[PDB]
Write a protein that binds this ligand. Structure first.
Ligand SMILES: *[C@@H]1O[C@H](CO)[C@@H](O)[C@H](O)[C@H]1NC(C)=O
Ligand SMILES: *[C@@H]1O[C@H](CO)[C@@H](O)[C@H](O)[C@H]1NC(C)=O
Ligand SMILES: OC[C@H]1O[C@@H](O)[C@H](O)[C@@H](O)[C@@H]1O
Length: 713
């Protein structure tokens, strides 16, 4: 119900309560009600309350940087950050974003994304998030939020909840069972709350026939009471449907205030009328304002000297180091046959594909608003989560500069013409072919793709381009920039394809980061955060075309389905090649963990014991090969078989270690009570089952190097 004394939120509440006492109803209605779609200078705005020096709250997109700004960095999308498996870069990314958001005079950044989590590879906005795994996405959420808010900026965990597809997102009902709702999809929102996230945004879709922004169970019972969330719930943009029920269900903020056309103003004067007509109690509005002002006080935004709103300010500083680092360390090397990579002093190189050069995407062209195009090199998906590039380093330009510097002749075919490609590739030492797939928010249809992807094939005749290049050249490196999984079986069926580089979504540092890896200045060290299957039919979920997604797969999404259904993916979750090898030894498991329901009083995150450490798993990792490289060690836990049906393996830890040849290091996985828990629907509690837990540590969800047990009496 209420945050405890002597904690950041507790002090914010005291402050918030003192402010609330100086306000009248109009003051209060102005704090919770957006001024209207594009009614203010920001993406979202509310009305100031001078009596407590409360500004018009300025809310701006999005998860990867400042939208509409002309002096901001384009950070990598979240999926790329997750792909680094590096908590330091992830936290640094949130911090840098936070610095830019404050420097621009925005109070609330609308991100990061824990929903969609990303159960379907076709999902158009999955790339804004952190991969398909609740644990990793949770850790990322917490690190990104810690980073953002340490600057004194309010973060917004979105989208709550079960917005797993773009098609009919405003009408579809997501209908999973209670365990699935809590244990899979809500999980990462709990990390966000526990990170003291200031705000949560409710989604467009329905949850069991009830619009997410009108849903008392998810908003009040789960988020506020069970997760102990002390901040405010805002709507997604015009995701509000009623005046009264929205308010009474636990909605706190109407965004942006009207629909796109200026209609459907459900709060403002209509909320004033509902309170006056006794349809919404004053205590409810008092609660909304406490939550909103508490977030303001929590982040220190009440102190004099917060920058004024201005998105023309150059706020970039040297933040490109993060984008470079994540674009670089997030590249996943999938295939490296005959050790063709890293490249060394070839006489010639062909570079082939429209995705190698600057196009309308990189240019912020008027043909590509909200990044609604895959034209030229690709840095991110489309929609509200895209931003302007301050610059963009194309793969061709970077490759050309590095290659020319060593007397390597570069030949370019800058289109997707199969015949021009083969011609450029013929006779060259290597040919690097660039393919893409794109997607985004479901209000833009790009090349026939309505938001979600139509299929899992490369865009722009990508498969044919590679086949034509392979017909002309024995040594083909395929570089892929993509919003998600592509089936690569056709490309892999070509014996001429010796290397596959899953470069992900690099933003502005595309070319530099790729050159870093291709030439082996750094070994690639990113690993997959979703499964690349051998067949589109091997995935168990789809973009649903009807009014209902029953979520009948339950807990078994992505790799959990693959493990459960004994399907061999092409490249499994947690998979990544390196230019070196790593040996794992000496697995230990230290545990004090006791069985039963969690027993702590509810605080932000849930019962106070859920995020406390109960165990520690430790392994040694040595670099046994010939070159320096970082390894991503992963922990998977198997629950007792006596426990309610659970996936066979669940990611419960990861560590990243840079090792020079012969160097040895420690990977430590701290285990929180919740990491050994499942959600019990009947008691509405997290429970640790008694029995022997399987402990699996390795280089991927399939590449398990050592095993042990964790026993709970
Ligand atoms: C609705 O949600 C409840 C609780 O989350 C779940 O157990 C139930 O199966 C769902 N009902 C339908 C008809 O999908
Ligand atoms: C906004 O910032 C730009 C760049 O720093 C500056 O030139 C301009 O004066 C600012 N605009 C306002 C209205 O303060
Ligand atoms: O741009 C404001 C909001 O618009 C909505 O359409 C998106 O779903 C949100 O992610 C976004 O924050």
């Amino acid at each position: 119900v209420v945050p405890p004394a002597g904690t950041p939120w507790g002090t914010a509440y005291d402050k918030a309560k003192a402010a609330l006492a100086k306000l009248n109803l109009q003051d209060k209605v102005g704090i919770v009600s957006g001024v209207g779609w594009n009614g203010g200078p920001c993406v979202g705005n509310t009305s100031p309350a001078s009596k407590i020096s409360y500004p018009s709250l300025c809310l701006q997109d999005g998860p990867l940087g400042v939208r509409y700004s002309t002096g901001s960095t384009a950070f990598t999308p979240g999926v790329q950050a997750a792909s680094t498996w590096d908590v330091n870069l992830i936290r640094e990314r949130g911090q840098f974003i936070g610095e830019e958001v404050k420097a621009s005079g925005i109070h609330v950044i609308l991100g990061p994304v824990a929903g969609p989590l990303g159960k379907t590879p076709q999902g158009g906005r999955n790339w804004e998030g952190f991969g398909v795994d609740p644990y990793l996405t949770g850790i990322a959420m917490g690190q990104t939020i810690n980073g953002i808010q340490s600057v004194g900026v309010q973060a917004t965990a979105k989208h709550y909840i079960l917005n797993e597809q773009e098609l009919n997102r405003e009408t579809i009902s997501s209908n999973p069972d209670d365990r699935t709702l809590h244990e899979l999809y809500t999980w990462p929102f709990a990390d966000a709350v526990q990170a003291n996230v200031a705000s949560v945004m409710c989604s467009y879709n329905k949850v069991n026939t009830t619009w997410a922004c009108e849903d008392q169970y998810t908003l009040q019972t789960v988020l506020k009471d069970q997760l102990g969330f002390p901040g405010y719930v805002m709507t997604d943009w015009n995701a509000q449907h009623t005046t009264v029920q929205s308010a009474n269900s636990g909605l706190d903020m109407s965004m942006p205030g009207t629909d796109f056309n200026g209609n459907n103003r459900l709060w403002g004067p209509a909320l004033t009328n509902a309170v006056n007509s006794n349809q919404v109690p004053t205590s409810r509005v008092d609660d909304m304002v406490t939550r909103i002002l508490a977030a303001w006080y929590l982040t220190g935004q009440d102190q004099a000297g917060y920058p004024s709103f201005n998105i023309s300010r150059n706020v970039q500083g040297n933040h490109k180091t993060n984008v470079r680092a994540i674009a670089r360390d997030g590249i996943v090397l999938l295939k490296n046959d005959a050790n063709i990579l890293p490249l060394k002093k070839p006489a010639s190189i062909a570079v082939v594909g429209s995705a190698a050069i600057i196009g309308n995407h990189a240019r912020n062209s008027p043909s590509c608003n909200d990044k609604g195009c895959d034209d030229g090199a690709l840095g991110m998906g489309w929609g509200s989560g895209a931003v302007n590039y301050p610059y963009f380093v194309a793969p061709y330009d970077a490759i050309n500069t590095r290659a020319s510097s060593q007397g390597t002749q570069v030949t370019l075919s800058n289109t997707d013409n199969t015949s021009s490609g083969a011609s450029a590739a013929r006779g060259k030492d290597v040919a690097i072919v660039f393919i893409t797939a794109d997607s985004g928010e479901g209000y833009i249809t790009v090349e026939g793709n309505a938001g979600d992807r139509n299929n899992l094939d490369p865009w722009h005749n990508g498969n044919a381009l590679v086949q034509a290049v392979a017909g002309a050249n024995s040594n083909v490196i395929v570089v892929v920039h993509s919003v998600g999984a592509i089936i690569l079986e056709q490309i892999l069926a070509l014996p001429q394809v010796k290397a596959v580089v899953w470069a992900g979504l690099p933003s502005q540092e595309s070319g530099n980061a790729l050159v870093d890896v291709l030439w082996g200045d750094v070994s690639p060290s990113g690993k997959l955060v979703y499964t690349i299957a051998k067949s589109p039919n091997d995935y168990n979920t789809r973009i649903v075309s009807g009014g209902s997604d029953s979520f009948s797969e339950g807990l078994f999404i992505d790799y959990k389905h693959f493990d459960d259904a004994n399907i061999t993916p092409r490249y499994e979750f947690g998979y990544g090649l390196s230019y070196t090898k790593f040996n794992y030894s000496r697995l230990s498991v230290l545990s004090t963990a006791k069985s039963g329901p969690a027993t702590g009083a509810v605080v932000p995150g849930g019962p106070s014991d859920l995020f406390q450490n109960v165990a520690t798993v430790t392994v040694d990792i040595a670099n046994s090969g010939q070159v320096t490289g970082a390894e991503v060690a992963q922990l998977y836990i198997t629950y007792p078989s006596s426990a309610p049906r659970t996936p066979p393996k669940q990611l419960r830890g990861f560590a990243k270690l840079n090792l020079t040849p012969g160097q040895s290091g420690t990977a430590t996985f701290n285990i929180r009570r919740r990491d050994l828990s499942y959600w019990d629907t009947a008691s509405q509690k997290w429970v640790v089952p008694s029995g022997s837990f399987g402990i699996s540590v390795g280089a991927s969800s399939r590449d398990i190097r050592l095993t042990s047990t964790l026993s709970v009496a």
